[PDB]
Amino acid sequence: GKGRIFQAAKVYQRASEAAATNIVSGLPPRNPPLWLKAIESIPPAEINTRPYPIQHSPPNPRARKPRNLFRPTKIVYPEDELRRDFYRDHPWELARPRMIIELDGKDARFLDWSKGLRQRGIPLSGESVVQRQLWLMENQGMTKQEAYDKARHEFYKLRQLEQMERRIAVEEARMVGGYFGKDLLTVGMELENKTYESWKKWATTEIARQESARASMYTNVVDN
């Protein structure tokens, strides 16, 4: 028994009895702690009582002696199957960074998926395609594939314009005397040079080191 008897839930019951009477028989009990009356009407909650957890999926009806009746179940939605299909068809869509840090939690209040892929507050990513697909598939009664094609093609027409802006925006700026810094292609190559040079130092050092091992195999200390 490595545990200890924690009586944190009975601090009131214990303190209420110790303050009811006085140790010195024949005198009135002294004033109780200042906290005894503050939580007089705020009892603790019931702890350590395993309930039947919420079932997020229909439990196996064929099981006659089911186990894990007090185990929280996995939360699975209809979108999980769509996210896996999309991101697998567009693996490099994961390279596009996406922030999962919420600002105030009120993001699903301005999302009306009957308008289109572009919504307020969230970026155009594989989720917008999934939420748009789920809407058409349910409301418009489209099949998984039909809704997928429609919502998928709207995603491309919006991404194409994004890549065209970067090219034209730069070309347009130089036509009026606008210069920029080092592009990502150049910066990436310079970093490889600094690393390749460090590898060259490691190669020449080990190569020379192996020569000693090859010469140390045979013995020539006599100097014939």
């Binding site: 705020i42 603790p44 702890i47 929280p72 939690g105």
Partner: protein, 290 residues
């Protein structure tokens, strides 16, 4: 000569540039359009919320439990399900337990109680100190020395105390009582990481002191009196809880002091100070007779 002389000009031009840069920053900084700033990292300290909703708790990652493997089945009552390999704490259970603790921190402060906010983690110092300022309580952001409650006579020996009246203004004449009086103990502890410091929570249960803790999925819920199922590993969820509890104490101290101005004291002299009064009359009686 001309090289080091340049620094003399720059070092001397910083005041001018700073003033001019500060003025210019007030002219064209906000001209384009209005930004709908709806989240600032240091917002739970500059102006914490009075009450936390489900959106605030979710945005603060107050529902991220620990890995399913590392769980305490005792606290399977606050878990909503399983996702990303972790247990998801119910957003409704976290709010109902948080609103209850706020009612506890408020009343204890309304009855002149001594609260203690304990958060001992690398970045939990600004949070606990800010909560204490609002609730006029004590803070603790380092390892709790074992025995500071059960062995307070020794540990808190030379620490000074003071006697205050209804309106928190000090009273004169208790000089002899502040030398024999034994050290104080918190009337309520608010731990932001109960899993770490169980020596503190045990002294509270051993000394009959109520406690409030943030019970993560792997924490034993039987260590405190009032649990707050939430993610204690997140620095953003702890600042929100502390702010709520901090505001609760503030709102409690306001009522207590506002009632004192009307001659309505919400508390009576503690037993320790009460005994000193009786002895005072006994010694004073001798002066009357003799």
């Amino acid at each position: 000569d001309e090289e080091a002389l340049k620094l003399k000009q720059q070092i001397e031009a910083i005041p001018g540039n700073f003033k001019l840069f500060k003025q210019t920053k007030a002219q064209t900084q906000k001209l384009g359009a209005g930004v709908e700033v709806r989240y600032i990292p240091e917002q739970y300290l500059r102006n914490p919320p009075s009450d936390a909703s489900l959106e605030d708790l979710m945005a603060a990652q107050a529902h991220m439990g620990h890995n399913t493997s590392l769980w305490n089945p005792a606290n399977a009552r606050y878990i909503y399900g399983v996702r990303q390999g972790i247990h998801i704490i119910s957003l409704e259970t976290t709010a109902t337990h948080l609103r209850r603790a706020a009612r506890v921190v408020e009343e204890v402060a309304y009855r002149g109680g001594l609260i203690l906010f304990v958060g001992t983690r690398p970045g939990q110092r600004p949070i606990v100190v800010r909560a204490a300022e609002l609730a006029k309580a004590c803070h603790l952001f380092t390892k709790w020395r074992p025995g500071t409650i059960t062995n307070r006579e020794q540990l808190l020996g030379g620490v000074p105390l003071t006697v205050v009246d209804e309106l928190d203004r000090p009273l004169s004449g208790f000089e002899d009582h502040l030398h024999d009086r034994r050290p104080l103990a918190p009337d309520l502890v608010v731990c932001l990481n109960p899993k770490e410091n169980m020596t503190l929570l045990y002294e509270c249960s051993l000394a009959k002191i109520p406690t409030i803790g943030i019970i993560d999925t792997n924490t034993n819920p039987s260590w405190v009196t009032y649990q707050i199922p939430a993610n204690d590993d997140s620095l953003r969820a702890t600042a929100l809880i502390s702010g709520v509890l901090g505001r609760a104490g503030e709102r409690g101290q306001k009522r207590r002091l506002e009632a004192a101005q009307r001659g309505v004291v919400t508390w009576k002299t503690p037993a320790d100070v009460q005994g000193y009064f009786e002895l005072a009359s006994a010694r004073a009686a001798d002066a009357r007779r003799r």
